[PDB]
mmCIF file of C-alpha atoms and ligand atoms in Angstrom:
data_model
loop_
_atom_site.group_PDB
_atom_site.id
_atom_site.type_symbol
_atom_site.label_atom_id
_atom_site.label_comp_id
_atom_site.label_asym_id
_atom_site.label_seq_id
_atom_site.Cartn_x
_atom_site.Cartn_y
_atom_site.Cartn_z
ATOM 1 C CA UNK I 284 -8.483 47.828 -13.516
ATOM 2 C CA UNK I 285 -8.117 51.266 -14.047
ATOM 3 C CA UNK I 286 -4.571 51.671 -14.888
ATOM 4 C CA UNK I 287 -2.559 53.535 -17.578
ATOM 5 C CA UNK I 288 -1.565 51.713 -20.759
ATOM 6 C CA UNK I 289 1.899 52.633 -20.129
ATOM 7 C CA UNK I 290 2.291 50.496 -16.548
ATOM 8 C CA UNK I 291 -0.130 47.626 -17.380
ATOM 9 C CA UNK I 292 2.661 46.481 -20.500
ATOM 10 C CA UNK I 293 5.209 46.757 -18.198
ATOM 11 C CA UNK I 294 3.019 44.403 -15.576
ATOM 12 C CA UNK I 295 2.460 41.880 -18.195
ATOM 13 C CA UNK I 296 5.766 41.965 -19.874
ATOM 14 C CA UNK I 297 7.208 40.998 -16.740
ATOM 15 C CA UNK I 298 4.856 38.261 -15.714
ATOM 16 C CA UNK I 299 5.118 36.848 -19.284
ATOM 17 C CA UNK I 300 1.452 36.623 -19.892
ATOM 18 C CA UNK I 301 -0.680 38.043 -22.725
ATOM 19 C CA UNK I 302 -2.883 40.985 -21.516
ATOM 20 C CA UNK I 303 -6.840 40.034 -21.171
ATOM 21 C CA UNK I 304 -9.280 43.548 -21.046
ATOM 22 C CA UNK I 305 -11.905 43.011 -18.337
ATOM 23 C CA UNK I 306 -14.027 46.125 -19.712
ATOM 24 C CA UNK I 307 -14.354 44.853 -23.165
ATOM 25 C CA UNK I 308 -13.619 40.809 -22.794
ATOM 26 C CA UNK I 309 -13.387 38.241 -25.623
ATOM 27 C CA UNK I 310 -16.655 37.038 -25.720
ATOM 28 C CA UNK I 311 -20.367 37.763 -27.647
ATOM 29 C CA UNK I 312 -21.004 40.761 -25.010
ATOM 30 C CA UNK I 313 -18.043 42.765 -27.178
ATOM 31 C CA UNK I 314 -19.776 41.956 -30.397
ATOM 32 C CA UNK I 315 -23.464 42.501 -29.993
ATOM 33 C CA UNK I 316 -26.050 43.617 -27.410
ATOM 34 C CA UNK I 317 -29.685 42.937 -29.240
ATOM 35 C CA UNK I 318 -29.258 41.263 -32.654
ATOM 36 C CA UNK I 319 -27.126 38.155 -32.398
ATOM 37 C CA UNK I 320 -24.557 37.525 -35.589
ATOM 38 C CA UNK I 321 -25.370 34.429 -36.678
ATOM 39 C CA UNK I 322 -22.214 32.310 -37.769
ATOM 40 C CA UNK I 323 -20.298 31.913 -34.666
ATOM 41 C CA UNK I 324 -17.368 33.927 -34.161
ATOM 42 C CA UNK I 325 -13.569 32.566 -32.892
ATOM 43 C CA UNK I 326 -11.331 35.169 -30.957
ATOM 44 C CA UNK I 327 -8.156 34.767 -32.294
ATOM 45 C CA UNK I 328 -4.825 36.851 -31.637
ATOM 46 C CA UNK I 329 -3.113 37.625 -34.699
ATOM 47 C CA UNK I 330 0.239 35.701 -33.813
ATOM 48 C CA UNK I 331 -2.364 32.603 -33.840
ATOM 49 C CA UNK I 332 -4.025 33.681 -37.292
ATOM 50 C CA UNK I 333 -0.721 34.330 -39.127
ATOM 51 C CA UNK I 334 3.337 33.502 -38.879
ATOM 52 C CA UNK I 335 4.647 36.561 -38.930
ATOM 53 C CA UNK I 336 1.993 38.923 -38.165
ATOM 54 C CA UNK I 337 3.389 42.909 -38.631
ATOM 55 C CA UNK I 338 1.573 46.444 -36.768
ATOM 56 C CA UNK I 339 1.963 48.452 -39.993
ATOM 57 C CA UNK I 340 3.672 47.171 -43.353
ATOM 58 C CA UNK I 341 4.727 49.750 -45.549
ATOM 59 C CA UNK I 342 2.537 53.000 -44.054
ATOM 60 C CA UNK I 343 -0.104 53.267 -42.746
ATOM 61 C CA UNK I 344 -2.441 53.804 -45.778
ATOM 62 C CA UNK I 345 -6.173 54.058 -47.013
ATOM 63 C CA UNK I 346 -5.485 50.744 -49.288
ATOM 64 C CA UNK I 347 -4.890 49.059 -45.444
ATOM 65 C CA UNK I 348 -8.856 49.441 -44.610
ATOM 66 C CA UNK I 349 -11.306 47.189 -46.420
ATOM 67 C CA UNK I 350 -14.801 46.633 -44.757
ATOM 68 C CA UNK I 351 -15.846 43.227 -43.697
ATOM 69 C CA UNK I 352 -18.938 41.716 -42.412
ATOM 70 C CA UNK I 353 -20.021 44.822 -40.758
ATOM 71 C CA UNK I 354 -21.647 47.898 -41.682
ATOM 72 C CA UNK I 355 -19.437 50.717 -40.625
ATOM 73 C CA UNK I 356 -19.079 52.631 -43.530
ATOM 74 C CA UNK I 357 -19.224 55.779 -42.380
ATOM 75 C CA UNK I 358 -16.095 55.069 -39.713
ATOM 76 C CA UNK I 359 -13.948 53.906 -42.012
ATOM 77 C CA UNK I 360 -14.350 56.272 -44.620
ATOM 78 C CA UNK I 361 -12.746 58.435 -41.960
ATOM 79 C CA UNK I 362 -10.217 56.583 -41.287
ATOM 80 C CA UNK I 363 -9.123 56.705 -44.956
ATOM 81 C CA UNK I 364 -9.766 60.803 -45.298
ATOM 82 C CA UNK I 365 -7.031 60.799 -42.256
ATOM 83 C CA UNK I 366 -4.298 58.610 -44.171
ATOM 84 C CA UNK I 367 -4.261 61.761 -46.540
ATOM 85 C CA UNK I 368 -2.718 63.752 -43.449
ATOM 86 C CA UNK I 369 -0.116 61.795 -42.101
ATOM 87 C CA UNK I 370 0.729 64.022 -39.349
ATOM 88 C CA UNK I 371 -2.314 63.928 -38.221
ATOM 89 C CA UNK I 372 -2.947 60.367 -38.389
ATOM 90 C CA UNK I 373 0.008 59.561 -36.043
ATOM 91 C CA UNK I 374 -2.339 61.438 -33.003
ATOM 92 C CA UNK I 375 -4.632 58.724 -33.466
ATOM 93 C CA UNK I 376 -2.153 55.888 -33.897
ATOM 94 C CA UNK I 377 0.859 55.657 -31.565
ATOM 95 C CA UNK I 378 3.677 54.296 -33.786
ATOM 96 C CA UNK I 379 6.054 52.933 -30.937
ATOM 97 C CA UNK I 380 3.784 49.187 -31.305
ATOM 98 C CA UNK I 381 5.163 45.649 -32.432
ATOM 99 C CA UNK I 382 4.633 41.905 -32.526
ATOM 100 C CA UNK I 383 8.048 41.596 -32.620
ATOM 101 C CA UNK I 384 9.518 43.337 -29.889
ATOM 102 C CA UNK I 385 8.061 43.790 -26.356
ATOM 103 C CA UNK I 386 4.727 42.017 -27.415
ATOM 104 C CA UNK I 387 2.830 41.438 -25.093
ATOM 105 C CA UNK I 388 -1.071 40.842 -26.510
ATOM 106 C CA UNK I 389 -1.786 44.816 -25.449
ATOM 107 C CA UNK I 390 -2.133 47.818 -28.207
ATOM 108 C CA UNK I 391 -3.505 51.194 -27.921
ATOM 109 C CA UNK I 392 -4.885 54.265 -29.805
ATOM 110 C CA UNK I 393 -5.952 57.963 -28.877
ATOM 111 C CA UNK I 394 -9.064 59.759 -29.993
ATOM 112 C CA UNK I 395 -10.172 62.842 -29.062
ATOM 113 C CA UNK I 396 -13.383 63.105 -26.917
ATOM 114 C CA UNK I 397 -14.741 66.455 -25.180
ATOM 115 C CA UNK I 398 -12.224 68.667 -26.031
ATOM 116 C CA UNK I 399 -8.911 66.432 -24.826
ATOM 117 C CA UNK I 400 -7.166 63.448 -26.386
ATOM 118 C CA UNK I 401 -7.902 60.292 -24.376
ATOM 119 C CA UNK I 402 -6.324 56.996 -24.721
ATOM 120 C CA UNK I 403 -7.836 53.730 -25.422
ATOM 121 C CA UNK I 404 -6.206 50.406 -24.090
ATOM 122 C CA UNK I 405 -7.363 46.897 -25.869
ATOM 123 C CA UNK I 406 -6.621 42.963 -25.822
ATOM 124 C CA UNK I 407 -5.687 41.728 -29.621
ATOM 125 C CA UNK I 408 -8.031 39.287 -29.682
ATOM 126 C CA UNK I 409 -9.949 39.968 -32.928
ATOM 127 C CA UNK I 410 -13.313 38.037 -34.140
ATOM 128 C CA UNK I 411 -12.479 35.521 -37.086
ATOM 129 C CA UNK I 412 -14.188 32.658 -39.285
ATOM 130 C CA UNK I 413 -12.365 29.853 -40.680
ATOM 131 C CA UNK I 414 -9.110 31.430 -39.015
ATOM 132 C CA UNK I 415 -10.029 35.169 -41.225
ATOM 133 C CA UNK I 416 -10.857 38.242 -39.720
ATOM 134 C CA UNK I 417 -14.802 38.996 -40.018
ATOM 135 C CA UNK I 418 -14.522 42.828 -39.361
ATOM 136 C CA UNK I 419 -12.224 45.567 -41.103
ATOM 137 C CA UNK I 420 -8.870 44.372 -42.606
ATOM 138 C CA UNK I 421 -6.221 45.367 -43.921
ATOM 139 C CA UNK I 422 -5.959 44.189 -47.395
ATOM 140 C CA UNK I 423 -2.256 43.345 -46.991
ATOM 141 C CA UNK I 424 -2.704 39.908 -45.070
ATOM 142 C CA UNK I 425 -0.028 40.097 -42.431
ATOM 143 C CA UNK I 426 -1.273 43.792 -41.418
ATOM 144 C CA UNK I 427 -3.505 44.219 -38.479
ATOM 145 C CA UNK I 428 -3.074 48.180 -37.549
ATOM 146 C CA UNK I 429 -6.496 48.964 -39.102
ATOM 147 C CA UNK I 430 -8.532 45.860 -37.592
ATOM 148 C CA UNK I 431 -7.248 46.509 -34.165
ATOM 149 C CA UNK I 432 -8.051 50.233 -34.576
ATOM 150 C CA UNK I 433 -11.644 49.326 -35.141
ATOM 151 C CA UNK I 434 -11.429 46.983 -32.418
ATOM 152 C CA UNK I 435 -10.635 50.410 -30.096
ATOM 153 C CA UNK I 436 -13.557 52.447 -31.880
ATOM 154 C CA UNK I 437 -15.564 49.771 -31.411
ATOM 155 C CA UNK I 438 -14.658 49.588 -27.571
ATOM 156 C CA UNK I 439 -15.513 53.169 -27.391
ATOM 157 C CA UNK I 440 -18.874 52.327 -28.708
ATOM 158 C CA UNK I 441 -19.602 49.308 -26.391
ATOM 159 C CA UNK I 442 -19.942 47.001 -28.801
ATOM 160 C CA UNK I 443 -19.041 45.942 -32.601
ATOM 161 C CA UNK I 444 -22.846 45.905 -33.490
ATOM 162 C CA UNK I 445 -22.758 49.495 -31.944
ATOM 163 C CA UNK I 446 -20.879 50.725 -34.885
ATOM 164 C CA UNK I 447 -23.522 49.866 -37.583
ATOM 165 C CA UNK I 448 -24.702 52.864 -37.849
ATOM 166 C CA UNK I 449 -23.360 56.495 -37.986
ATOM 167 C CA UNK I 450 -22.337 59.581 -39.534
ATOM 168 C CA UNK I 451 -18.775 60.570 -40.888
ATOM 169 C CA UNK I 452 -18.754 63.576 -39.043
ATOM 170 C CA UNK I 453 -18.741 61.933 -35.973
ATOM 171 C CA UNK I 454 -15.657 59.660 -36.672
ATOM 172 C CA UNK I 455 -13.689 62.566 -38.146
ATOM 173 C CA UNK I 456 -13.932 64.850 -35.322
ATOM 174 C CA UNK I 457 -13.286 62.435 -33.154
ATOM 175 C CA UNK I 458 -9.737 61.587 -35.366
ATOM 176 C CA UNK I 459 -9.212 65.722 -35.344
ATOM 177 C CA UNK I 460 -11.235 68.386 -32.879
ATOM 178 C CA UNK I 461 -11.973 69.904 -35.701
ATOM 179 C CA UNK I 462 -15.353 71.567 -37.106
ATOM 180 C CA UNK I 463 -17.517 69.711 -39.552
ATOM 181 C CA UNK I 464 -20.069 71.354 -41.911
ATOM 182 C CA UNK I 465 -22.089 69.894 -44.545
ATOM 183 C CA UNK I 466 -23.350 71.048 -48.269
ATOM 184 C CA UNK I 467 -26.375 69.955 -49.975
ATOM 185 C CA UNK I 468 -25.082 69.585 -53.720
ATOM 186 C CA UNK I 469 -27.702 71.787 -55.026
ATOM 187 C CA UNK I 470 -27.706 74.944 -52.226
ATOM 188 C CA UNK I 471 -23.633 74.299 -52.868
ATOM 189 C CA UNK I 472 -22.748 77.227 -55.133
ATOM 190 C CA UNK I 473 -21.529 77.269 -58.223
ATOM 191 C CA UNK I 474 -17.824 77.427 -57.078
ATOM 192 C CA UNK I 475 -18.153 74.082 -55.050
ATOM 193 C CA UNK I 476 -15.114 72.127 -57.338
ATOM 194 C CA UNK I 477 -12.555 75.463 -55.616
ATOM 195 C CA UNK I 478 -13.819 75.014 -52.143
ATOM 196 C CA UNK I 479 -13.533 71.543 -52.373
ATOM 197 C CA UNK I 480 -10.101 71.507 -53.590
ATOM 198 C CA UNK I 481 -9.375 74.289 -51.100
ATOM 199 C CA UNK I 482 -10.250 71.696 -47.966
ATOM 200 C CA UNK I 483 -7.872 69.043 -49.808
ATOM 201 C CA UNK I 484 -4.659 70.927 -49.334
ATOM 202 C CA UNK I 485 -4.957 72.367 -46.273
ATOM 203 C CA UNK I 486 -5.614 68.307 -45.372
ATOM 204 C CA UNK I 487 -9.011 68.997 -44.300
ATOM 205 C CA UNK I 488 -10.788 65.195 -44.547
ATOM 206 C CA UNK I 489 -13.681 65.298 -46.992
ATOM 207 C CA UNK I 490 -16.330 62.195 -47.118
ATOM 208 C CA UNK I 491 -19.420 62.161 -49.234
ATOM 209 C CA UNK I 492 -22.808 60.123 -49.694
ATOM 210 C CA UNK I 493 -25.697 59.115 -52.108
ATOM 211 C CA UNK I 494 -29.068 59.739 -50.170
ATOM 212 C CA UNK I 495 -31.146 56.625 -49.053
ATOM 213 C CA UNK I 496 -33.948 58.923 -48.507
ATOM 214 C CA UNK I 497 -22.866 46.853 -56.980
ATOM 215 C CA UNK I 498 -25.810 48.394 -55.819
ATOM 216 C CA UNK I 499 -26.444 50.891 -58.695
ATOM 217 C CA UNK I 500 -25.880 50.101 -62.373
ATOM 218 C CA UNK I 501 -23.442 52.854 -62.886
ATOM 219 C CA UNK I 502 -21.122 51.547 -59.787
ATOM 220 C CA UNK I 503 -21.910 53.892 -57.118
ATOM 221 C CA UNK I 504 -23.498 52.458 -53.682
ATOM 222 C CA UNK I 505 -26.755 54.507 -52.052
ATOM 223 C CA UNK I 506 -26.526 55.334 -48.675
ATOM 224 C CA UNK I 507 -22.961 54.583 -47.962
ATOM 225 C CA UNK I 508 -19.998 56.851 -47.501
ATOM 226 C CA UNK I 509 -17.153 57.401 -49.762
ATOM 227 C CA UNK I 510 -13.734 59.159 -49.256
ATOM 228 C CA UNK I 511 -13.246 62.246 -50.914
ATOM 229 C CA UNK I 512 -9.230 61.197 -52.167
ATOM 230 C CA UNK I 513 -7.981 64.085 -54.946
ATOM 231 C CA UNK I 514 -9.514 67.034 -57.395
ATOM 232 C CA UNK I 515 -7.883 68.077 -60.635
ATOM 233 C CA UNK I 516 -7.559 69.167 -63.679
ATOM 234 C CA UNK I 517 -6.746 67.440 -66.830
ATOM 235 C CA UNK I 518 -6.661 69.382 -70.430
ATOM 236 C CA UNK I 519 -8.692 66.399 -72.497
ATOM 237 C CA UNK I 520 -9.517 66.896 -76.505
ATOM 238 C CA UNK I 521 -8.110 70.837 -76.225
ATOM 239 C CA UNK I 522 -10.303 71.495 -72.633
ATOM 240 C CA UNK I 523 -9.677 71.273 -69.287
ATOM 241 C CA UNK I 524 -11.847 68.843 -67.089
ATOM 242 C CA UNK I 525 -12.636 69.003 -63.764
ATOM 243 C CA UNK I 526 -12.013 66.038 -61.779
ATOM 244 C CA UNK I 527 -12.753 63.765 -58.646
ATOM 245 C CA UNK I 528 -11.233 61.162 -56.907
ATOM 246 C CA UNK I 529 -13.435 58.969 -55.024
ATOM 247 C CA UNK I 530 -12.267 55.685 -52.490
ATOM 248 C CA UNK I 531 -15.279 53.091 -51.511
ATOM 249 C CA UNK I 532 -14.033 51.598 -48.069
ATOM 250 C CA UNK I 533 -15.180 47.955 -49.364
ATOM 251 C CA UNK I 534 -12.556 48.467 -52.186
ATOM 252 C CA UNK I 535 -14.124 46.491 -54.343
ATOM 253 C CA UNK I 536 -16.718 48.499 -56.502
ATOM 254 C CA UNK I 537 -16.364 51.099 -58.373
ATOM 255 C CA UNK I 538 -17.947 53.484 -60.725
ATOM 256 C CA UNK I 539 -18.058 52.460 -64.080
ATOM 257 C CA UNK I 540 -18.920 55.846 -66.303
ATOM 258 C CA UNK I 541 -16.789 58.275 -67.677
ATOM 259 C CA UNK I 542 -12.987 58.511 -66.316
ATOM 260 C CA UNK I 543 -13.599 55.201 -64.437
ATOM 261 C CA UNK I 544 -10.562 52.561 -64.439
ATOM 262 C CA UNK I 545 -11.172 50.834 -67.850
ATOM 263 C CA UNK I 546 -12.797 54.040 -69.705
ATOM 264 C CA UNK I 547 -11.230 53.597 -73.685
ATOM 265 C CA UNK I 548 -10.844 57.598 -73.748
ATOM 266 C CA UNK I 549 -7.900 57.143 -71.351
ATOM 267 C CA UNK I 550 -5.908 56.339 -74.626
ATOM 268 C CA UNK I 551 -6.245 60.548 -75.157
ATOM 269 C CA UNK I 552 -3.967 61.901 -72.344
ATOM 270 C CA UNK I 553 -0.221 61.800 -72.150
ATOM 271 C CA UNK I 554 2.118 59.931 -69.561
ATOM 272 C CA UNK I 555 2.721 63.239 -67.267
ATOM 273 C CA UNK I 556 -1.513 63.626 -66.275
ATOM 274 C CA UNK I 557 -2.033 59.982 -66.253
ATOM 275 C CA UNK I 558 1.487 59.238 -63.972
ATOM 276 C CA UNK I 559 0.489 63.116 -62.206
ATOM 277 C CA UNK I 560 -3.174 61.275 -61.793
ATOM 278 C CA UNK I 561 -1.668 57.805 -60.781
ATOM 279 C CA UNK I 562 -4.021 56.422 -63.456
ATOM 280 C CA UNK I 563 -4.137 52.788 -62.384
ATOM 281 C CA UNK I 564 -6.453 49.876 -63.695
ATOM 282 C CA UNK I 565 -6.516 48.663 -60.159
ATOM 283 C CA UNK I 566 -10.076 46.653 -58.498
ATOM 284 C CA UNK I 567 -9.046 49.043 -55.359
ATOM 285 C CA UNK I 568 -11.862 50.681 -54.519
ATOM 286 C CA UNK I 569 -10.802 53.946 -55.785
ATOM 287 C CA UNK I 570 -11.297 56.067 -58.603
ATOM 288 C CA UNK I 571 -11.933 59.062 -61.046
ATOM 289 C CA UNK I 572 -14.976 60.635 -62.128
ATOM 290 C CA UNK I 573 -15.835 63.577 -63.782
ATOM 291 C CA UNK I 574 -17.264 66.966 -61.282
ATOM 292 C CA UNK I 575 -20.107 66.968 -63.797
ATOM 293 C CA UNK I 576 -21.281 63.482 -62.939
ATOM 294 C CA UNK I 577 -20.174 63.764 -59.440
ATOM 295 C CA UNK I 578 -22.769 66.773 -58.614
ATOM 296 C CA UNK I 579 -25.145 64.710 -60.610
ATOM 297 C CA UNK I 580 -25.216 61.549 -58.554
ATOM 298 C CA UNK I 581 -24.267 62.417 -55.465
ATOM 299 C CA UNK I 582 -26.424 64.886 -52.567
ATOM 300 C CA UNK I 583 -24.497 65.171 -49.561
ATOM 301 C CA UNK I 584 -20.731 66.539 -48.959
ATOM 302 C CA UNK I 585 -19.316 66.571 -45.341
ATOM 303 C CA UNK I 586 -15.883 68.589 -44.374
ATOM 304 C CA UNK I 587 -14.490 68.556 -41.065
ATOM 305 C CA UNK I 588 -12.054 71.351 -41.351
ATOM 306 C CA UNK I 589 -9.089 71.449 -39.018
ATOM 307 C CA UNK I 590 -9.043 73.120 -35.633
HETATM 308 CA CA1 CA G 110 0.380 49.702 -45.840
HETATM 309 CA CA1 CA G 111 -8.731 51.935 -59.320
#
């Protein structure tokens, strides 16, 4: 108990054991504390689950976190804003881990908490059904950074169940120190589509949200974040149009309106825009839509802007 990551791998490297965490053990304590999840869960360690399980394959990547049986939307549309800024992302994630060398059942992650970084040690045991995971994925099946990252957050929290609510704001200052503000859509001025694309570049992470107060027939989802991804402009039909690029962490629905992945007026844009756009017809997650329809629809925009 109460040791540093770095010494307790060493301990169990040497003993030959994999590592077990007291604080946050195996077991339905980790998952819940009042409502109870009803199929029952199996912990399994991901050298167990797969046959040649990886830490990251191919970066480290917003495709690499896809929402499972959990509502957590609001963390991991964080976690996708911070793939944007890959310097940043490797404060969070330590990139000196493996299941291939030195494994030894232990991982760990950094997050930063009252003003300082602090470091978060975990056991890989993840929860899993039918030998699956349950909880965040990666949608690459041999890559667990993003599941055991969750895992960590979740720690943090006290439990899994802990996580089923929250704000975006919260997760992103907690990847960055930085300052987040928000803008209602309509008390945003007029020049919203420049400050937006302003935050973008200088890698400022950018989430947004449909109030509460497919689940909508024009493919958006109420009350659940999204990951602001890219803004540009295309010159469509003699005009420029302003754009947005939207991710949905379950990567699985999408809008369906104008600019969307299978919209027929795609056919009027050359090669350059739609290879500048990386114009894909891809069930991802992610997509284009106009900054018209995007004011329309949507009523809350958060920025955490960099410290
Ligand atoms: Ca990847
Ligand atoms: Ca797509």
């Amino acid at each position: 108990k109460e040791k540093t990551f770095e010494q307790l791998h060493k301990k169990c490297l040497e003993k030959k054991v994999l590592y077990v965490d007291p604080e946050f053990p195996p077991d339905e304590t980790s998952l819940f504390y009042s409502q109870k999840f009803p199929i029952q869960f199996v912990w399994k360690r991901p050298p167990e689950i797969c046959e040649n399980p990886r830490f990251i394959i191919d970066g480290a990547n917003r495709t690499d976190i896809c929402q499972g049986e959990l509502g957590d939307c609001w963390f991991l549309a964080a976690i996708a804003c911070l793939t944007l800024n890959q310097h940043l992302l490797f404060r969070v994630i330590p990139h000196d881990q493996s299941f291939i060398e030195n494994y030894a059942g232990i991982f760990h992650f950094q997050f930063w908490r009252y003003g300082e970084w602090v470091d978060v040690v975990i056991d890989d045991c993840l929860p899993t059904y039918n030998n699956q995971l349950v909880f965040t994925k990666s949608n690459h099946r041999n890559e667990f950074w993003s599941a055991l990252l969750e895992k960590a957050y979740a720690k943090l929290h006290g439990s899994y169940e802990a996580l089923k609510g929250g704000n975006t704001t919260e997760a992103m200052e907690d990847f960055t120190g930085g300052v987040a503000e928000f803008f209602e859509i309509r008390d945003a001025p007029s020049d919203m589509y420049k400050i937006m694309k302003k935050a973008i570049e200088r890698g400022s992470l950018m989430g947004c949200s449909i109030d509460d107060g497919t689940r909508m027939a024009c493919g958006l989802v109420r009350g659940h974040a999204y990951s602001v991804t890219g803004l540009d402009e295309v010159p469509f039909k003699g005009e420029k149009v302003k754009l947005v690029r939207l991710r949905n962490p379950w990567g699985q629905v999408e809008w369906n309106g104008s600019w969307s992945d299978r919209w027929k007026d795609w056919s009027f844009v050359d090669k350059d825009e739609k290879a500048r756009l990386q114009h894909q017809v891809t069930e991802d997650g992610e997509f284009w839509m106009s900054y018209e329809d995007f004011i329309y629809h949507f009523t809350k925009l958060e920025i955490c802007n960099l410290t």
